[PDB]
Design a protein around this ligand. Structure first.
Ligand code: SRM
Ligand code: SRM
Ligand code: SRM
Ligand code: SRM
Ligand code: SF4
Ligand code: SF4
Ligand code: SF4
Ligand code: SF4
Ligand code: SF4
Ligand code: SF4
Ligand code: SF4
Ligand code: SF4
Ligand SMILES: [C-]#N
Ligand SMILES: [C-]#N
Ligand SMILES: [C-]#N
Lengths: 363, 417, 363, 417
């Protein structure tokens, strides 16, 4: 017979709550009832409550099983995750919503929240999209989980309530690869190196395909050294992106004293009100200081509190800056502008700025 | 404590990933102590100890991994090796397996219990729900367990296949779409599923110059962040009038400041409100979603629904971060999705023939030009593809666009034609 | 002794009208009287009348002498030219104004106009800035002076009155060297080629510096062929820019039948209301058709008229387009969008789009 | 009918250049027949005929010219040869002389008559008033005449020197500024002359890697297109409050729709009118000039005047057309302009040491980056230089910004520091 392969994921229709399967594509309206609770009303008249909780993304299989027991008790054995790694249950009996919230909170320690409401114009801060850091990745400049935890411990109140005037995503990339929509977040934390690689010639000879390692460098700082069958770095051209070490074990550039994070702001994915936008560096570097990263967390909070105190309803960070200008932005956030922030990544073509990176256009 | 630095991150109100790691360690060890069939009971404790040393050193303790896989696949398992293998043998090999998620991350409890049972037997017990591309992550097992773990996965009542990695089609993802959302413009979950199954071979067996990612969003809100983190972002849209329930507008008008929170915020001034009637000039609407988001009981997307295709989305390397740009202003999204599949297959044949090692599709299009791209997918240039026409006169002309002349004859004569 | 050198232009102060010299740097307000006549009132309460006329830019010395006769009869021996090559007279007596106007028409054949008035919001069309064309330059794709003659004959009526709701500049360049402000004008006409260079190996060996010619090509279409000792051109890479012909007499690309003009729009220099903007191509190619260049003239007028018809007061072409969008621009001006207009000039860095190319910022 | 194609362009209301060409040949020949000392009476008809052949052929008949000039200067004469040299003998040589213009193109009649007399004797009688950069263009003469002509110019009672061409400082130019304009924030005519005089050598004797252009605009309306066509645009601005005469606003408000034509058009909403009182929030003002342009009887620039310096302006070749960008947010413009001169001289020292053959300053700054450029001119980075901070994290750090570490010691040890 042979081992089965190429069978794909289980078909989702078989894993839907009966009420959701029945009303599929036949919804009238949703209504955010309270933080963490969205009421969905079907054309049939069915009403379902989607109850959302924050998770640490990394889960013990024992947590998943506890969440299973809970979903069997309140959600008829059905549940989902969201695209920011919150977990949602489906409740038909409104009188059970609060029983579910309290049981989740007690059994697994996950908070109800992560929602927002454009109608009233009051927004929660949702989960932080982040990746592996030191838990599993060989190329990080910073940890991911430790920072997410330190940042959410500080901004927790914004997750459980709708206190912000507009949408704010915070996202974390443990190195310049991103592994996420970190490059288009209202506030982005990005691991960076500040030191060049030092070629290990032996490891390069044994393990690195040279022309492709060379072609990976965005600034052309790498050349083959044919004499010694290795690679040479022009340190004056290198900006410590890390891509040559992705390609080649013989090119490490980690310095635990000088690796840390840049803070970027003003990205936007959705089209509402204003076109999408890539985030922009406003703090060049902050060190790694585990377990709590106080310097990093201090700047993230400072930027979020300044925007939140001055933004109009619906006015996301980039929209706030559209209004006031970067001059006043730097003033109100208490941030310094330095030459580091003036873009010099030469390879990107200007013609990209003339392409429509948006679904907004007229028919 | 053996873990004084990580113990700090058990304090604070946000649920702690450290408690997740320790809960796994305690209960995997107890399972094994109980005589349960658990292959790696020390795996989660090893990971904890490695991480504690990493917190002290402020650096990763992982090195480049071996190349590892299940029999029959070249993608979906990523080898990872610890530099502390001698001090912590239990994480010397600690690979991840990406497990394809159901579309929109809908699960039943039986599906999830089957996943827990198999991972408890074969790996560390740690998981991520979910990896950023969408997959479930099974975090940490050994080379010898990958195949038997995959065999068990396939033998479950609700079985799960491996997802993508490497230079393949990665696992496609989808927002919840019409399962829950009244704004959805097509069936994101069904499209996602169908793509995944159609292109199983492309996903399991990497054959391309680099990775290729597809994500499906039900409307322009883009709740899967398709335009930034897929190469091929399928984003719901419509071609006709926004649907207006005038009576419901009047209800919103009784409490909501429509003038300031709706009228003034429309990017094109398409929507007006005079206290008695809402008017939307749909030739001016750019379908940003804002008014609908604000007034979901009163306004809905139009009836002529489909998707806009955005091409090129990617992280920075090598040539710069890309939010995808307009490739197809409108395509219908109707099973078995032949028009989408035709565009995908044309792109992939071209990219595979012309692409360099580790060149993403958006980079290739930057290199060869929009004209060649459009010819590959058989579409005409459209003003909606740009924010502005070019700011310089350095245009290429097709040789058939030139007027016949002595000069063009000279080019022909020399074989420069 | 030898010969006087390094002495510079004569001193401007000594060449000013007495009333202008007296009141220098001390004016109160100006006031556009009728098209072609600006009243200028000193703080010292002195009054002065600047009277503007159109010129062909190219001038016979005998026309200059005739002007000088006019200048002595009406303008106290003084006059000036504008930064767009009109000529201006300084009338102290307002009753002598219309006489000057009739005598200028009568003698030198120049029109009164080229003025605009932001106060009422009524603008004239001013002279067209242009270069040498077939009159003197060795790299023109088009004529300058004839196309200018042509156009302004069509649009004459716009020079002598204030027929426009905002300022519109027309500019011309005979080749991609773009020898004026053409690259930032409301409407611009740029000479282009559409055929690659056919190397003349003889003329290259004798008269070209290969490495510099080769390095001048913006697309790397050129490669030295050291055999042979000449240059090779990869035609797939060549976009007919002409730059290699500027460097080397052996690289002509002139095809009388495929050479022509592109029309670009939406450039702006002033800061007023909206940032400065570079011109954009909206018609890829029109032919040379001496003497009148019918097709070129047709499309220019089509674009001016179409914009004038829909534009609000002060709303300049790029501001129009900011309002209506490009989809609507193409429909209303009756022009086709083609792949030609999607930018593919690879060399320009994206970071330029992030630099402030403007004096508008906050203190 | 010698010139049937050109003759057509003597029809029409607009002032015929063809008539300018024909008027010259007629009156030059008539003079040389009178025994007047006219060296080239055939030149202008020579040109008339060559241009006709050009109209027929729809192409130029000028070929690459040999380098030619005056004694002691290397720039200001542009050599040009006709490939119809034998058929039309009198245009085989037909060089241009660029003649330095008085700041603002202000002239007394004497000045002009003197120019006319020299060119009648030594030239074609054709001119351009004025060249794009600003110079007067004496159009068409021979090599043997260049030196005698220039000696005559220099010997005129109102003498004119040669302007700039080649890899030099080109002739600077300036808007009318304070001679006629109430908007003028500094004496553009004086600065332009002082600069012209100060760097006569850099102008007359090209020594740089390419050309370098300076233009001087009185205020942000930029009436000499300085930001587009000079490498170094000195544009007037101010630092304090727009001066507002409130009753003058009232006279305006009796007939002008200030709400629509002024308030709504201000790009930052700084300016308000309530029917009684005009208010400007000068902290929000970006000095676009609109409201001043609208209401010149009532509104004036602040009294703390100076200029903003935009760097990099140029035509496309090679790296793309450039409107210059903020280099110096504010600088005093006060005789003898040492702060400006100090800036110019540092850029030139640096440009001459680091620039490639035919690299414009704008292209040097894009290649070397703004941190180096700012160091050269002794100025700090300022948020006002950019429209936005960088969209990617790929920052260079100075080695003195790094924390000392075992790694930095490894770099030092190997000499990679
Ligand atoms: C459940 C979830 C989709 C999923 O398949 O899992 C989702 C669900 C909804 N989205 Fe979303 N969005 C979800 C991720 C996103 C993301 C993607 C991301 O962050 O990576 C964004 C794009 C972010 C961006 O723009 O940068 C997203 C941008 C929106 C927008 C835009 C808000 C704006 O003002 O620009 C709306 C409109 C709104 O606020 O009502 C929205 C609105 C909605 C609505 C109200 C649509 C509806 O009719 O039900 C849904 C309820 C959200 C709420 O709390 O009010 N959804 N939504 C997502 C949950 C993430 C979480 O746990 O927090
Ligand atoms: C597991 C996952 C992180 C996570 O914990 O969520 C992941 C982890 C890795 N990513 Fe990724 N990426 C993950 C989603 C992404 C995304 C977002 C997406 O897929 O939605 C991106 C941005 C979109 C894109 O691909 O550009 C992303 C952009 C990259 C990049 C840069 C690609 C580029 O063109 O710049 C690298 C570089 C490379 O491919 O060599 C990369 C490479 C890697 C490597 C394999 C490390 C490396 O430097 O060679 C990661 C393995 C770590 C490990 O061994 O555990 N990963 N990576 C994400 C996938 C799990 C899943 O199956 O769901
Ligand atoms: C005479 C001249 C100065 C000079 O020769 O040194 C000049 C003079 C004035 N300009 Fe100018 N500008 C002169 C070239 C320019 C050009 C430069 C160019 O076209 O190459 C433009 C920049 C073009 C651009 O922005 O693309 C220019 C942009 C302005 C602005 C533009 C209005 C706008 O909405 O953008 C103002 C404001 C205004 O309309 O009052 C202006 C206003 C003025 C004022 C009204 C200022 C004043 O207080 O007197 C001057 C009277 C002109 C008039 O017709 O109202 N001047 N001005 C210029 C030659 C003009 C001609 O038509 O021959
Ligand atoms: C004389 C003049 C045309 C006119 O009649 O108006 C002129 C004509 C020529 N220009 Fe220019 N430029 C003239 C002002 C300009 C301007 C405007 C300005 O200076 O204010 C520009 C745009 C600003 C700039 O410099 O970029 C301009 C940009 C160029 C270009 C490209 C520069 C670039 O870096 O992209 C070429 C190429 C070159 O210099 O090698 C060029 C070179 C040339 C050559 C020498 C042709 C060549 O390929 O070598 C021209 C000689 C024509 C002839 O033989 O009579 N000329 N040229 C203009 C100067 C008259 C004067 O001296 O006052
Ligand atoms: S962002 Fe970087 S560090 Fe984090 S997983 Fe991706 S590659 Fe590894
Ligand atoms: S780190 Fe980045 S910039 Fe530096 S050499 Fe490697 S690839 Fe090049
Ligand atoms: S993308 Fe659109 S359809 Fe999908 S969940 Fe978001 S709002 Fe709903
Ligand atoms: S969808 Fe956006 S653009 Fe369209 S009317 Fe609503 S708000 Fe305006
Ligand atoms: S633009 Fe071209 S053709 Fe015209 S003068 Fe300048 S270089 Fe010569
Ligand atoms: S014409 Fe332009 S593109 Fe073609 S070879 Fe010459 S320089 Fe290169
Ligand atoms: S730039 Fe300013 S000062 Fe100079 S003429 Fe124009 S408006 Fe007057
Ligand atoms: S100068 Fe421009 S920016 Fe300032 S107040 Fe007047 S209109 Fe507004
Ligand atoms: C990508 N992993
Ligand atoms: C993607 N995995
Ligand atoms: C020279 N221009």
């Amino acid at each position: 017979e042979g081992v089965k392969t190429d069978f794909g994921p289980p078909y989702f229709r078989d894993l839907l709550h009966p009420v959701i399967a029945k009303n599929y594509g036949k919804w009238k309206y949703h209504e955010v009832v309270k933080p963490g609770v969205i009421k969905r009303v079907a054309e049939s008249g069915d009403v379902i409550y989607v109850v959302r909780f924050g998770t640490p993304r990394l889960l013990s299989i024992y947590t998943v099983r506890e969440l299973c027991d809970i979903a069997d008790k309140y959600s008829d054995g059905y549940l989902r995750w969201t695209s920011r790694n919150n977990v949602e249950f489906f409740v038909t009996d409104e009188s059970k919503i609060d029983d579910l919230i309290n049981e989740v909170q007690e059994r697994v320690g996950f908070p109800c929240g992560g929602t927002w409401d454009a109608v009233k114009g009051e927004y929660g801060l949702s989960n932080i999209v982040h990746t592996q850091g030191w838990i599993h990745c060989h190329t990080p400049a910073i940890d991911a989980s430790g920072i997410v935890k330190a940042v959410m411990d500080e901004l927790y109140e914004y997750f459980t309530d709708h206190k912000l005037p507009a949408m704010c995503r915070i996202s974390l990339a443990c190195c310049a690869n991103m592994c996420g929509a970190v490059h288009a977040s209202d506030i982005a934390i990005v691991g960076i190196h500040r030191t060049p690689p030092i070629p290990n010639d032996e490891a390069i000879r044994k393990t690195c395909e040279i022309p492709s390692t060379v072609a990976a460098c965005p600034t052309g700082a790498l050349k083959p050294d044919m004499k010694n069958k290795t690679i040479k770095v022009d340190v004056e051209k290198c900006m410590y992106c890390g891509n040559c070490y992705t390609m080649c074990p013989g090119m490490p550039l980690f310095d635990p004293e000088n690796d840390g994070a840049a803070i970027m702001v003003g990205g936007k994915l959705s089209e509402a009100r204003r076109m999408p936008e890539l985030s922009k560096v406003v703090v060049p570097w902050v060190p790694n200081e585990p377990p709590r990263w106080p310097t990093l967390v201090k700047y993230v909070k400072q930027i979020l509190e300044a925007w939140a105190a001055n933004a109009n309803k619906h006015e996301r960070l980039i929209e706030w800056v559209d209004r006031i200008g970067w001059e006043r932005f730097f003033e109100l956030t208490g941030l310094e502008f330095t030459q580091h922030l003036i873009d010099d990544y030469r390879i990107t073509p200007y013609f990209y700025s003339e392409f429509r990176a948006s679904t907004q256009f007229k028919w | 404590s053996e873990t004084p630095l990580l113990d700090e991150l058990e304090k604070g109100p946000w649920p702690s990933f450290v408690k997740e790691i320790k809960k796994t360690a305690e209960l995997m060890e107890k399972a094994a102590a109980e005589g349960k069939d658990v292959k790696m009971p020390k795996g989660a404790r090893g990971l904890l100890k490695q991480l504690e040393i990493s917190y002290k050193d402020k650096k990763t303790h992982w090195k480049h991994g071996g190349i590892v896989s299940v029999v029959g696949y070249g993608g979906g398992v990523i080898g990872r090796y610890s530099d502390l293998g001698e001090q912590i043998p239990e994480v010397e090999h600690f690979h991840t397996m990406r497990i394809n998620q159901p579309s929109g991350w809908f699960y039943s409890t039986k599906a999830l219990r089957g996943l827990c049972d198999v991972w408890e037997k074969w790996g560390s017990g740690l998981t991520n729900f979910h990896g950023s591309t969408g997959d479930i992550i099974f975090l940490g097992t050994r080379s010898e367990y990958l195949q038997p773990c995959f065999e068990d996965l396939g033998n479950l009542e609700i079985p799960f296949d491996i997802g993508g990695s490497g230079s393949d089609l990665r696992t496609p993802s989808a927002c919840m779409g019409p399962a829950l959302c009244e704004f959805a413009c097509y069936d994101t979950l069904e499209l996602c599923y169908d793509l995944t199954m159609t292109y199983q071979d492309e996903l399991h067996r990497p054959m391309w110059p680099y990775k290729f990612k597809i994500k499906c969003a039900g409307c322009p809100n883009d709740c899967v962040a398709s335009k930034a983190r897929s190469d091929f972002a399928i984003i719901g849209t419509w071609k006709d009038d926004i649907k207006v329930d005038q009576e419901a507008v009047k209800e919103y008008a009784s409490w909501m400041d429509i003038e300031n929170e709706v009228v003034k915020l429309c990017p094109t001034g398409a929507i007006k409100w005079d206290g008695k009637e809402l008017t939307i000039d749909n030739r001016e609407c750019v379908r940003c979603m804002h008014c609908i988001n604000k007034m979901p009981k009163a306004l809905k997307p139009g009836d002529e629904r489909g998707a806009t295709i955005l091409i090129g989305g990617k992280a920075p390397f090598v040539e710069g971060a890309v939010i995808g740009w307009v490739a197809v202003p409108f395509v219908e999204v109707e099973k078995p999705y032949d028009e989408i599949k035709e565009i995908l297959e044309a792109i992939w044949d071209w990219w595979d023939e012309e692409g360099k090692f580790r060149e993403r599709i958006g980079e290739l299009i930057w290199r060869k030009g929009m004209r060649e791209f459009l010819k590959v997918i058989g579409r005409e240039a459209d003003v909606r593809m740009v924010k502005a026409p070019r700011n310089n006169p350095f245009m290429f002309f097709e040789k058939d666009e030139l007027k016949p002349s002595a000069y063009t004859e000279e080019l022909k004569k020399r074989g420069m034609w």
